[PDB]
Amino acid sequence: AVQKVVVHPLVLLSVVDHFNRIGKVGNQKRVVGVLLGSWQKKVLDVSNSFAVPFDEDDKDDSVWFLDHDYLENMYGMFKKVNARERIVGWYHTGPKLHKNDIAINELMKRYCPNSVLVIIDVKPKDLGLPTEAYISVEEVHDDGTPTSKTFEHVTSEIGAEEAEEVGVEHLLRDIKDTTVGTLSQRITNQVHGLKGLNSKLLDIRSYLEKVATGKLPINHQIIYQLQDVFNLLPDVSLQEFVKAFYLKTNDQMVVVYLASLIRSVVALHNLINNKIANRDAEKKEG
Amino acid sequence: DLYSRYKKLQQELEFLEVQEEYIKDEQKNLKKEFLHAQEEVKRIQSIPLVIGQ
Amino acid sequence: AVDTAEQVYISSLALLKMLKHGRAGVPMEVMGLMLGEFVDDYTVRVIDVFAMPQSGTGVSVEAVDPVFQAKMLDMLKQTGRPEMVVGWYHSHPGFGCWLSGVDINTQQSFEALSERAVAVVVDPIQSVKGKVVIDAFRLINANMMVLGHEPRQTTSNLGHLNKPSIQALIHGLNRHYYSITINYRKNELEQKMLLNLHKKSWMEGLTLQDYSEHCKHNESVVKEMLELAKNYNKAVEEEDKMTPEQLAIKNVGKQDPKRHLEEHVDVLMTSNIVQCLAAMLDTVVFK
Amino acid sequence: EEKFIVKATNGPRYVVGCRRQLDKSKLKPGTRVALDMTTLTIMRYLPREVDPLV
Ligand SMILES: [Zn+2]
């Protein structure tokens, strides 16, 4: 149904507010906020959101506390001031997906339309993208397990339309723009290996752990496609790609001729002014 | 004075040597600021505009 | 009779709420309320900022519904927002950020409770996207016309308050109407969450997806940009063939504002993408 | 092909861009279109007709 979503940083800075207005009480649980957006178009666009007092139990996980009057009053006043945005779903700040999320999401599945779920981290130490759109749809399983709520990952992007780019750029004054060239390219080409190294290294350890020490079926069926796609590149002998290395290396030669020739053109004004300026300033100095 | 010029001059050796990485920092940072302000004054020029004579 | 040097603390909450409220800043007059806590005399901090529904009357004391204001404030009191109102904001599109008689009258009526009564006017309509410089307004006492206008100490920040130096509004209407300085604040959670959030907003999902796209587009699409780049290079070299004649005749003074050097340097920078991504293809092919 | 010149009824002329939703079919010149006050975007076009042709 929905291919991609658009999440503005305003809601995540509202999660920064979720971490600001705590008051140093010692709970810092998965505070659930009421996510708002535009479900009209096929693409999802989050503009702003708000929160609702949400408290769980220490031992029992099935305890969840929501509010209908606060949702209808905040949504009623927010719709009165801005009727272009309506309820879409919710989101929790907890890093782990608990079992009670089917009951928490089920309320906004009954009263509200199909709600999207977003799992983020309480500490911004994760290098990866903090936002993951998880659609709440029921899928048929091939093994015969009963139909249950399934959270499929929907791709997400963090973009701002008109003003939030200007506000973020003014508040930071440290981040740089695209700036194609040497630095913005070589930084990605340096740290990209760590950007994949922390992800893959962080995933395959618990993966290999759950291979031998795993039960409660984790959908082993998708592991066959996992190792299949991993074995779709069986160390090609590079025999056919030699001519492609001749093509890319020939373009490299083109960059060599462009650099040497163009820089040789740049040497004109320098290697002329260095003489005509020094000898004339010297002969005319005294 | 004759032999003291060596060790006294070493302080000038260090004071002039310390400026190398400093001018490296200035020449590597002020051009980053040059492209920052350059793109900042470049992005002011927007396509929607009025045409005069 | 005493005055200090006050400064308005502006976080990203009120800023982004004034940016979404500026996107909703239609020509019709809008209303808003600022909240916060008063810790001492010469400091003021804003935390909570929301919008108000529009009305046909516009900015006025009659449009402010006390049961709606107190209702939403009470709903903020039952939640984790124990902050009292500190001021009200609005938008003045087109005719400038100055305040009319109605605005100064509802400001005079709304300043009876809070002695500070911070007033902010956002106007992103005619302001370019390069700067988001915003200014906070204040109300002066009418009985201070005999004595000095603003006996504010620490006159250093007035140089930073001199950035809005429009020659009609500031000193064109500065009588009985002055302003105050604005500073910001950012903790480590906003710095790392918003910084990594913006870097990720300019980065990819797995960060390895769109690299090979350009690494392999260098052979398909960039070749056209390389041929056209050489067409501009030769298109300048055809004049650089004529340059050594003038440079061989006059050698005195410069009449052409074109440098012919930095543009070719930029062409070399765009041409170095092949070199920088060749090692990327070497890594993808290797492992 | 992406950004062209518009001629307003009031007399002053402007230049606008292309919206990601519409295509280059109706974007060809000679067709009266509509603009927006903010960002000068294009929502849809305006088909001509005689005041009297209706
Ligand atoms: Zn007005």
Retrieve residue A120's tokens: 């983020």
Q: How far apart are CA A215 and CA B22, in angstroms?
A: 60
Q: What is the dihedral of CA C139, C140, C142, C147, to 10 degrees?
A: 180
CA closest to A173 among chain C residues:
C195
Question: Count of CB atoms within 10 A of residue C60's CB?
Answer: 14
Residue C246's alpha-carbon distances to A276, C72, C214, C264, in angstroms, are 15, 76, 42, 21
Q: Which residues contact B52 (CB under 8 A, 6 or more apart)?
A: none
Q: Which of C124, C44, C53, C137 is nearest to C84 (CA)?
A: C44
The residue with tokens 């009191």 is: C77
Count Cβ atoms below 10 Å from residue D32 Cβ, excluding itself.
Answer: 12
What is the sign of the dihedral through the CA atoms of B14, B15, B21 and B23? negative
Query: Taking a contact as any Cβ pair under 8 Å apart, which residues of chain C between 109 and 128 contact chain B?
Result: 128
C258 inside 8 A of chain B by CB: no
C201 φ/ψ angles, rounded to the nearest 5 degrees: -70, -20
Q: Which two tokens stand for residue C28?
A: 């019709």
| Resolution value in angstroms | 6.1
Q: Is C219:A251 a contact under the CB 8 Å cutoff?
A: yes
**At which residue do the structure tokens 């649980």 appear?**
A29
Report residue A120: phi and psi, to 5°.
Answer: -125, 180
Q: Locate A196 and state its tokens.
A: 């994949």
Closest CA to C194 of A15, A269, A138, D54: A15
Of A216, A2, A147, whose CA–CA distance to A89 is shortest? Answer: A2
Quote the CA–CA distance of A119 and A33 in Å, as a whole number: 12
Mutate to test the interface with B, among C128, C262, C263, C269 (most CBs of B within 10 A): C128
d(CA A117, CA A152): 10
B18 touches chain D (CB under 8 A): no
Q: Judge: C129–B43 Cβ closer than 8 Å, yes or no.
A: yes
CB neighbour list of residue A81: distance below 8 Å, 6 or more residues apart: C51, C52, C53, C54
Residues from B contacting C (CB-CB < 8 Å) are 40-41, 43-44, 46
Question: Rounded to an integer, what distance in angstroms lies between the CA atom of residue C194 and that of residue A51?
Answer: 20
Picking from B20, C193, C115, the residue whose alpha carbon sits closest to that of residue A158 is C193
**How far is B2 from A77, CA to CA, in rounded Å?**
88
Long-range contacts of A180-187 (CB under 8 A, 24+ apart): A180/C269, A180/C270, A180/C273, A181/C269, A181/C270, A181/C272, A182/C269, A182/C272, A182/C276, A183/B32, A185/C273, A185/C276, A185/C277, A186/C276
**Taking CA C135 as the corner, what is the angle to CA C130 and CA C137, rounded to the nearest 5 degrees?**
165
D33: DSSP letter: B
Distance (Å, whole) CA C25 – CA C17: 11
Q: Does A177 touch chain B (CB under 8 A)?
A: yes
CB A76 within 8 A of CB A69: no
Instruction: Report which residue type is found at A154.
Output: V
Q: Provide CB contacts within 8 A for D23, sequence distance 6+.
A: none
* C76 CB within 8 Å of a chain A CB: no
Is C69 near chain A, with CB under 8 Å? no
- Cα–Cα distance measured from residue A139 to residue A133, given in angstroms and rounded to the nearest whole number: 17
Contact C136, C119 (CB under 8 A): yes
Q: Are A45 and A85 in contact, with CB atoms under 8 Å apart?
A: no
- Alpha-carbon distance values, A263 to A72, A252, B50, C171, C266 (Å): 68, 16, 40, 53, 11
User: Are the Cβ atoms of B48 and D14 closer than 8 angstroms?
Assistant: yes
Chain B environment of D3 (Cβ under 8 Å): 47
Rounded to the nearest angstrom, the minimum Cα separation between A164 and chain B is 16
Determine contact, residues A265/C237, Cβ cutoff 8 Å: yes
User: What radius of gyration do chain B's Cα atoms show?
Assistant: 24
CA distances from C152 to C172, C177, C262 (A): 21, 15, 49
Q: What are phi and psi of C238, to 5 degrees?
A: -65, -25
Q: Do A82 and C270 touch (CB under 8 A)?
A: no
What is the DSSP-derived secondary structure letter of residue D12?
-
Partner-chain residue, chosen from D12, D13, D40, that has the shortest CB–CB distance to B48:
D40
Closest CB to C132: pick one of A22, A124, A167.
A167
Q: At C278, list the tokens.
A: 């060749």
Name the residue among C131, C194, C281 with its Cβ closest to that of A168: C194
Task: Give yes or no for a contact between C139 and C108, defined as CB atoms under 8 angstroms apart.
Answer: yes
Strand partners, D14: B50, D6
Q: Are C42 and C6 in contact (CB under 8 A)?
A: yes
Check if the beta carbon of residue C242 is closer than 8 Å to that of residue A225: no
By C-alpha distance, the chain B residue nearest C127 is B44
Taking CA atoms, A267 is separated from A263, A264, C265, in Å, by: 6, 5, 12
CB A39 within 8 A of CB A88: yes
What Å distances lie between residue A53 and A66, A116, C119, CA to CA? 7, 20, 31
Other beta carbons within 10 Å of A159: 14
A179 interface with B at CB cutoff 8 Å: yes
- Kindly list the distances between the CA atom of residue C40 and the CA atoms of A257, C5, C180, C183, in Å, as whole numbers in the listed order: 68, 12, 17, 17
Please tell me the experimental approach by which this structure was elucidated.
cryo-EM
User: Which two tokens mark A174?
Assistant: 């440290």
Backbone torsions φ then ψ of C85, nearest 5 degrees: -65, 140
Helix, strand and coil percent figures for chain C, each rounded to 5? 40, 15, 45
**Residue C39 CA to chain centroid, in angstroms?**
27
Contact yes or no for C85/C33 (Cβ under 8 A) = yes
Going D23 to D29 to D30 to D36, the CA torsion angle's sign is positive
- Contacts (Cβ under 8 Å, ≥6 apart) of B2: none
Tell me which chains share at least 3 CB pairs under 8 Å with chain C: A, B
